[PDB]
Structure 1
Amino acid sequence: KTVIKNETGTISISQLNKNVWVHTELVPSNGLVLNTSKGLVLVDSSWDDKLTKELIEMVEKKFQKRVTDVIITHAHADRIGGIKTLKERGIKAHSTALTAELAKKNGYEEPLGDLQTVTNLKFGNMKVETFYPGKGHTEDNIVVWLPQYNILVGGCLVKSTSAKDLGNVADAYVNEWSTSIENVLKRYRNINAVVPGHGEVGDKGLLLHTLDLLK
């Protein structure tokens, strides 16, 4: 897989696919860059505004298209933190209503609150499904599915192999997280890659790992 870094090793993009890339910023945090016929779409932005601006500028320059949309997978900072940058640049920031409600409560600018339990979006030819599986890492966590690739973005709901515990559980629902993981396994029975919130890309084994960490 082709991999491209900025000057610092602070931001790195790894090609999963002709049109799907994983972005990682330095903990490392992951999201996706979707190279579509109508622009770039990000699944998650970055830790804060400084890194979000750098991420956008890197990908706009490389791919020679604008970032048009971001999907925010929960209302914590590794996730909501670049919202000011998105809003001021006219980048549409999609989220569930609950994620937007939580962002506002916590003093962040609000994403759109447009995503339902299951939402199907199309960006050029790129199909994206968002799914709220229930509570887990947070109340509001969603996953994102690319049905043309059978790629799942697990976000913080899904732990990497290298994670040997659940991490920050202060906002977690450790008794509903296993059911939520089961909901993802039931919906998506044939998965090619799973992108955890943090750590190396894997497959359905990451979901099984997360289940074991919850015991």
Structure 2
Amino acid sequence: AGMSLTQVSGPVYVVEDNYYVQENSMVYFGAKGVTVVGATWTPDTARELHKLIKRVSRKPVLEVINTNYHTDRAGGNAYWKSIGAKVVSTRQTRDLMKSDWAEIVAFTRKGLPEYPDLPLVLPNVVHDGDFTLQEGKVRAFYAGPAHTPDGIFVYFPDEQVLYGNCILKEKLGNLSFADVKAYPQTLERLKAMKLPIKTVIGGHDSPLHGPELIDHYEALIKAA
């Protein structure tokens, strides 16, 4: 399919978005409603994800988290706003999106000319720090710069699932915005938190990994 939505553990689902360069995002089906982690590539891909969500649950999509300011994590925002979902980010992500959206769209279109010239759509729920959703069962945090300056991790304590965002993945991927020397320092700050992790969902390539995906990418970026 163009996109799939598949259970990984309990209420935690993985989105494989095969549009453009495959990106993986996540969905949490909560008691009051649905949290989407990563807005997907475009308003069209977001609409496709919503269609999948509505075959699983009748509960509203409450919020969508932009885990960085890039097109693969925020491109769907217009759609999510349009259906009354909150668009959630850190202040840093929001600020970088305001200043740099035009540039990331342009950059995206250099490699993907077919990608739409999307107007800026900012988060309307902005956090100054780390934050949680779903009664503490979705936990967003910053552990330093890596693939971009602002990228956050999302952790699901009950299921011991870590969303890797653009940060953790199988291949090196794109380093144009990366802080290559800080990247492993950020991964070591993450590892030092000693979070119980059974599963890491890579934001690109094949999603399903164990905690060793952290070590995998760390070794790669240290050779870059």
**Matched positions, count:** 201
The answer to whether structure 1 residue 203 and structure 2 residue 192 are counterparts is no
Paired with 1:113 and 1:209, the residues of 2 have a C-alpha distance of 33
Task: Extract unaligned runs of 5+ from structure 2.
Answer: 103-119
For the aligned residue pairs, the C-alpha RMSD in angstroms reads 1.5
Paired with 1:133 and 1:118, the residues of 2 have a C-alpha distance of 10
Aligned residue type for 2:165: G
- The equivalences for 1:1-215 within 5 A come to 9-26=1-18, 27-105=21-99, 106-107=101-102, 108-112=120-124, 114-121=126-133, 123=134, 127-160=137-170, 163=171, 166-200=172-206, 201-215=208-222
> Aligned with 2:177: secondary structure?
coil
Task: Extract unaligned runs of 5+ from structure 1.
Answer: 1-8
Aligned residue type for 2:186: S
Paired with 2:193 and 2:128, the residues of 1 have a C-alpha distance of 16
Structure 1 residue 113: deviation in Å? 5.3
User: 4+ runs of 1 displaced by more than 2 Å?
Assistant: 112-118
Deviations 1:35-59 (A, max 9, x none): 1110111111211111101111220
Give the corresponding residue for 1:4. none
Bigger CA drift: 27-36 or 173-182? 27-36
Paired with 2:28 and 2:40, the residues of 1 have a C-alpha distance of 15
Paired with 1:212 and 1:206, the residues of 2 have a C-alpha distance of 10
Instruction: Provide TM-score, normalisation by structure 2.
Output: 0.85
Paired with 2:59 and 2:195, the residues of 1 have a C-alpha distance of 34
Aligned residue type for 2:149: E
- Would you say the 8 A contact 2:169–2:213 is kept in 1? yes
Paired with 1:189 and 1:92, the residues of 2 have a C-alpha distance of 28
Paired with 1:62 and 1:113, the residues of 2 have a C-alpha distance of 26
Paired with 2:51 and 2:5, the residues of 1 have a C-alpha distance of 13
Counting helix residues as a fraction of each chain, which structure ranks higher?
2
Deviations 1:50-78 (A, max 9, x none): 11011112202332222111111101101
Paired with 1:126 and 1:16, the residues of 2 have a C-alpha distance of 19
1:153 to 1:199, Cα distance in 2 relative to 1, 3 A: same
Instruction: Provide TM-score, normalisation by structure 1.
Output: 0.88
Aligned residue type for 1:198: H
Paired with 2:38 and 2:140, the residues of 1 have a C-alpha distance of 12
Structure 1 residue 202: deviation in Å? 0.7
Deviations 1:9-44 (A, max 9, x none): 101012111211101111221111111110111111
> Aligned with 1:59: secondary structure?
helix
